[PDB]
Amino acid sequence: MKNVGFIGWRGMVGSVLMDRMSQENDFENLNPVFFTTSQALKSAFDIEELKKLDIIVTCQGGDYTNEVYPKLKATGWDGYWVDAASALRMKDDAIIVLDPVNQHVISEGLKKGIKTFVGGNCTVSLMLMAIGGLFEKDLVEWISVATYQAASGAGAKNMRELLSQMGLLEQAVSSELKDPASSILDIERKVTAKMRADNFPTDNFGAALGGSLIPWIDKLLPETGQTKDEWKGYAETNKILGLSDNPIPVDGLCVRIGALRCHSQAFTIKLKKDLPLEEIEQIIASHNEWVKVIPNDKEITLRELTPAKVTGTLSVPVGRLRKLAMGPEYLAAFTVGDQLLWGAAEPVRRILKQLVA
Amino acid sequence: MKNVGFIGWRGMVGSVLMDRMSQENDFENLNPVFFTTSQALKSAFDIEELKKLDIIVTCQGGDYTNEVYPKLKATGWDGYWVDAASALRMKDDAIIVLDPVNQHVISEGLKKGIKTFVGGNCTVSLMLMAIGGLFEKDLVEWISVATYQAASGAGAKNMRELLSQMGLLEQAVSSELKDPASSILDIERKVTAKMRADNFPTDNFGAALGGSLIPWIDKLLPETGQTKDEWKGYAETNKILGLSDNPIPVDGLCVRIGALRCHSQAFTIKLKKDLPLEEIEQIIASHNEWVKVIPNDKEITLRELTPAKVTGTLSVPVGRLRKLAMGPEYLAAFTVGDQLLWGAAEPVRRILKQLVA
Numbered sequence: 011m012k013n014v015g016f017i018g019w020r021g022m023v024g025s026v027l028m029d030r031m032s033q034e035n036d037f038e039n040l041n042p043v044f045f046t047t048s049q050a051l052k053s054a055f056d057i058e059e060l061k062k063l064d065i066i067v068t069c070q071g072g073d074y075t076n077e078v079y080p081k082l083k084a085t086g087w088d089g090y091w092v093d094a095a096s097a098l099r100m101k102d103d104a105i106i107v108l109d110p111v112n113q114h115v116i117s118e119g120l121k122k123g124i125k126t127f128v129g130g131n132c133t134v135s136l137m138l139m140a141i142g143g144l145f146e147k148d149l150v151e152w153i154s155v156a157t158y159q160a161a162s163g164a165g166a167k168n169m170r171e172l173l174s175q176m177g178l179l180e181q182a183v184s185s186e187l188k189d190p191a192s193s194i195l196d197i198e199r200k201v202t203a204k205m206r207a208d209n210f211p212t213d214n215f216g217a218a219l220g221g222s223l224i225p226w227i228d229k230l231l232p233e234t235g236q237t238k239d240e241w242k243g244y245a246e247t248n249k250i251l252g253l254s255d256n257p258i259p260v261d262g263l264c265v266r267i268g269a270l271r272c273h274s275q276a277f278t279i280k281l282k283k284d285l286p287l288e289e290i291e292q293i294i295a296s297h298n299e300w301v302k303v304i305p306n307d308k309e310i311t312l313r314e315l316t317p318a319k320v321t322g323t324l325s326v327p328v329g330r331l332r333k334l335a336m337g338p339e340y341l342a343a344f345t346v347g348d349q350l351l352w353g354a355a356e357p358v359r360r361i362l363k364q365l366v367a
Numbered sequence: 368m369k370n371v372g373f374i375g376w377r378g379m380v381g382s383v384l385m386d387r388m389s390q391e392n393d394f395e396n397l398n399p400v401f402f403t404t405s406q407a408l409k410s411a412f413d414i415e416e417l418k419k420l421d422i423i424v425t426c427q428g429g430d431y432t433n434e435v436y437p438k439l440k441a442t443g444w445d446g447y448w449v450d451a452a453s454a455l456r457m458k459d460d461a462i463i464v465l466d467p468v469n470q471h472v473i474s475e476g477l478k479k480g481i482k483t484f485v486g487g488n489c490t491v492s493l494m495l496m497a498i499g500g501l502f503e504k505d506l507v508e509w510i511s512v513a514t515y516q517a518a519s520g521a522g523a524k525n526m527r528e529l530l531s532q533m534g535l536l537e538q539a540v541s542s543e544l545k546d547p548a549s550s551i552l553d554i555e556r557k558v559t560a561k562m563r564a565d566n567f568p569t570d571n572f573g574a575a576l577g578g579s580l581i582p583w584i585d586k587l588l589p590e591t592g593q594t595k596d597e598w599k600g601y602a603e604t605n606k607i608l609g610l611s612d613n614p615i616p617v618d619g620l621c622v623r624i625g626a627l628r629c630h631s632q633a634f635t636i637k638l639k640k641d642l643p644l645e646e647i648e649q650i651i652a653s654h655n656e657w658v659k660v661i662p663n664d665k666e667i668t669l670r671e672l673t674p675a676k677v678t679g680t681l682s683v684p685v686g687r688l689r690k691l692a693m694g695p696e697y698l699a700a701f702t703v704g705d706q707l708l709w710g711a712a713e714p715v716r717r718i719l720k721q722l723v724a
């Protein structure tokens with residue numbers, strides 16, 4: 011059995027990984043060694059204790075990886091580094107994992123001698139898990155995206171802030187909501203007044219999220235005009251698919267909405283050729299066992315294609331599939347997927363399973 | 368002075384109209400006659416009293432219009448019908464108003480003898496107020512839209528449901544949020560559990576909105592696969608611009624999010640010709656006095672381009688302006704606008720002002 015080290019297993023992403031691993035009994039397949047950054051278990055900074063392991067799985071973050079990874083590689087360590095952080099995604103000796111989509115790229119990398127496997131961007135990996143069949147069959151020319159991102163991608167304190175903001179908004183008009191006769195405009199004026207107040211908690215977001223939205227995620231990239239999160243659409247979709255020689259354009263706007271764990275995305279996909287709707291539905295459905303084609307009907311979309319339904323599950327529903335008014339080569343698609351699972355911990359758990367097998 | 372009748376002035380849209388008219392002292396320029404549907408002030412069903420007026424302004428709704436309008440027209444009535452409802456929009460003797468955008472179309476209709484003026488679709492009106500300059504200079508080939516719609520477009524009870532939903536979500540984890548050391552995963556499990564519960568109020572939406580989203584607005588139109596709200600993009604943008612002979616494709620997905628009265632929209636605009644970014648910003652900015660070009664910077668986007676900022680104001684900010692990866696002919700734009708104002712009561716108030724002058 012492989013001796014595997016775990017760092018950042020107590021954080022949010024790390025906790026989801028521990029729970030998923032426990033659920034699938036992944037621990038009876040390896041020898042787990044747990045690390046801690048605390049001085050109050052082995053030290054996550056002890057390069058010699060980390061050198062003894064076959065595989066290192068980290069959910070600690072970029073600031074840790076950027077400190078520890080180069081120091082450990084400097085000792086001659088030929089083991090595997092599995093990372094949930096973004097820090098190493100864009101290095102040449104690193105492959106971005108999402109096995110139901112890029113199993114061939116990972117298999118070629120294990121053969122080539124790649125020792126660093128990093129999980130992908132949440133929105134990009136959730137997009138590929140949904141619309142993956144179109145990429146396999148080379149039907150994608152370009153994709154325009156508009157995201158509906160949850161607070162979890164920004165962190166734990168961010169989820170708490172959103173909930174606190176939601177509560178303070180209702181509390182502001184609690185008495186008025188009780189009587190069915192009260193003025194709706196008055197209620198609105200009071201909720202907007204509370205949203206705008208000095209004591210309204212906006213420290214983690216820098217703006218109100220509950221009852222609103224924030225059309226900006228991460229630092230600006232002056233060269234393209236994109237934000238770091240928006241840039242990961244072009245950069246990562248092509249790195250995951252091994253298409254760095256023939257880059258398919260994926261660009262759009264990344265917006266933060268008041269949801270807890272699920273990222274939703276609206277797509278305008280330009281197909282290379284004109285195909286029937288019934289065929290496109292079967293091509294999407296056949297790619298993997300997690301994707302779910304939701305028929306363009308009201309009651310079923312309301313019940314299936316929402317964060318309410320998908321939260322805490324591995325299911326990746328895709329729906330609102332129809333041809334757009336620009337041409338029969340323009341497809342409309344809307345998807346919903348859990349950020350902490352396929353967008354964070356699940357591709358990490360799955361590459362580990364392959365490595366310890 | 369013109370004798371003007373007001374129907375549905377106590378509803379939500381009608382109340383915003385009364386407030387705006389009062390704020391602009393519009394009552395000093397006309398003779399107001401108020402109608403009611405109540406049997407507990409003139410009757411909104413008394414065709415003879417309605418026949419005496421020069422103009423009828425209604426925010427009552429489609430079920431009123433469809434009953435009263437044909438009856439009153441059958442008596443030989445020469446006056447004007449100004450409607451906030453959707454009922455008459457697609458009729459040949461009716462023009463869809465939004466004067467900062469279609470003043471020429473309205474003037475030509477007054478000189479042609481058109482007697483019915485109907486306010487337009489909220490999302491379409493808010494889009495045209497934002498990027499009107501691009502339609503003026505005939506730079507738009509097609510537009511793909513992804514909307515972030517407020518609860519107000521669905522009505523008063525819907526806004527109340529959203530607020531009640533937000534409240535029950537925080538209340539479910541009230542003491543856990545006060546404790547800075549509590550588990551985030553435990554918190555989300557409880558919030559998701561309450562969102563999923565039987566007693567959680569989802570009556571008006573048919574699904575949870577607070578902490579979630581609903582990617583379906585209005586009835587299915589089996590013909591194109593679009594929803595009735597999505598269809599209004601193609602149909603209404605062209606009727607407002609008088610381009611029913613040469614239709615510019617506007618299509619996309621209409622999604623309901625947890626916002627009160629501001630609709631936000633993400634666009635992928637395909638320009639006919641390749642123009643510089645610094646020039647595209649000036650063209651959008653110079654179209655009308657309400658649009659506001661927000662520079663592509665973080666602190667300013669957070670402060671300006673949000674429902675929190677624009678709610679209850681006539682300001683229509685447009686931002687996140689950049690060239691997309693598909694080519695320099697592809698522009699990205701994000702806009703926010705108050706649904707009750709430019710998307711409902713404001714175009715109605717404005718055509719009335721022109722009619723009574």
